[PDB]
Amino acid sequence: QGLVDFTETQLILVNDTEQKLSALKYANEDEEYALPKIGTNSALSIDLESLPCTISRDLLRPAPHINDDNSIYAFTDAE
Amino acid sequence: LKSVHRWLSAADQSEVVPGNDNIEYFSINEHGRREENRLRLKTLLQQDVVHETKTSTSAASELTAVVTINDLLEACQETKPSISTSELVKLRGIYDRFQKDR
16 A cells, blocks of 8 residues: 555556456445345344354443443344 | 377477466456566466366377387387397307206
């Protein structure tokens, strides 16, 4: 990483002849996800997946002050 | 090995790296090879590592010895006789005298 000298830097053309760029995404969804189940007492077809690492007390946005209340501390995305 | 040379070294291997499948050569044509500096060529790396590939080690079609009469002609031009008559003139005596004689 660094600054570019627009007077004297290698500004190298590369052609994506293999359209690899089409595999890239910024996480944005193209459409609303299939079949929301709001109001159902239960939900299905979501798996469980072991953490790649432990996560701190700080990294969760909610952090209620109880000395011992949450050690199982699981989490899931807005889905 | 002489017979193998007419199957492994002649033509392709003396002229090019033969091969098939995988990432292969491509006409990348990305930029001139030496214009901004003498080292532009092959600055970019390959796209992916190969998973696996399968191919037989030998056949009558490839890599076999393909022996010929003229390879044996070369072989016999390169004769190396194990002994010479300067020994056999003595050894022949040693042979024949070994029987009927003591």
